Design a protein around this ligand. Structure first.
Ligand SMILES: Nc1nc2c(ncn2[C@@H]2O[C@H](COP(=O)(O)OP(=O)(O)NP(=O)(O)O)[C@@H](O)[C@H]2O)c(=O)[nH]1
Length: 233
């Protein structure tokens, strides 16, 4: 978490920042903590393919109204369309940054292609330079809601969660966003059974159901679902 200080070292190399956020949770996955006010910053709302389309549009409007440079994209959107959306200035030297899991390596791979002393640049056709390694932001989780949302987008591992109320919060957010009403306890006993997750004694393994469930949610395998609205639910 302390580097951060390293993000500052990477920032000195660049004049432009692409902040890679998950469109399902744009506040939760914001790069809060690090100062980008001296750089040209683009907010990229990634993974729109597994996000609620209505909620994503509201996020775009929200950021446009804040006077912010914002685009939306996904893994399967062509390199040409992405670059057109980004529309980098001729002098751009770009750092891709974000919290874990938001799609940064995937974006670099698309940008780079078969093209290629510390971090290296690759250049676009028009000369713009992009650092070939992303900066990864680890931020302060003070709230249960922030941890729950970072869990849902796969940014924060189940292993790192020490309060069961964070699992409950995440399930509540999920359940609301998809329509479910069921108790937490009943949902995960059932999931653990439907998936063959049994401990010794043949007891449903809730720990493993949670890990697998949230891994599946993070991957978009549990519905086209968003977890935050501008908005503010
Ligand atoms: N549905 C969907 N999945 C995506 C998209 N972009 C990336 N993913 C998936 O999200 C996961 C994480 O992607 P990755 O590019 O490795 O993210 P990252 O930000 O580099 N990860 P980290 O910093 O934690 O290493 C992978 O399973 C990848 O396939 C997208 O637009 N849509």
């Amino acid at each position: 978490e302390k580097a951060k200080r390293q993000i500052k070292d990477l920032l000195r190399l660049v004049n432009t920042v692409v902040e890679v956020r998950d469109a399902r949770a744009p506040f939760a996955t914001s790069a809060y903590g690090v100062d980008f006010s001296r750089k040209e910053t683009i907010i990229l709302l990634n993974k729109v393919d597994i996000a609620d389309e209505k909620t994503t549009k509201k996020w775009v409007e929200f950021f446009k109204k804040q006077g912010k440079r914002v685009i939306t994209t996904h893994k399967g959107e062509p390199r040409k369309v992405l670059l057109k959306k980004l529309s980098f200035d001729r002098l751009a030297r770009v750092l891709i940054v974000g919290v874990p899991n938001t799609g940064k390596s995937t974006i670099i791979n698309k940008l780079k292609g078969k093209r290629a002393k510390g971090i290296q640049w690759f250049s676009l056709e028009n000369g713009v330079k992009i650092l070939d390694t992303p900066g990864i932001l680890y931020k302060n989780i003070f709230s249960e809601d922030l941890a729950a949302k970072l869990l849902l987008v796969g940014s924060l591992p189940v292993e790192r969660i020490e309060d069961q109320r964070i699992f409950e919060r995440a399930f509540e957010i999920f359940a609301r966003s998809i329509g479910i009403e069921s108790s937490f306890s009943e949902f995960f006993e059932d999931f653990a059974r439907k998936r063959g997750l049994l401990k010794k004694g043949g007891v449903p393994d809730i720990e493993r159901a949670l890990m697998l469930f949230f891994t599946e949610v993070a991957q978009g395998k549990a519905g086209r679902v968003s977890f935050e609205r501008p908005e503010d639910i």
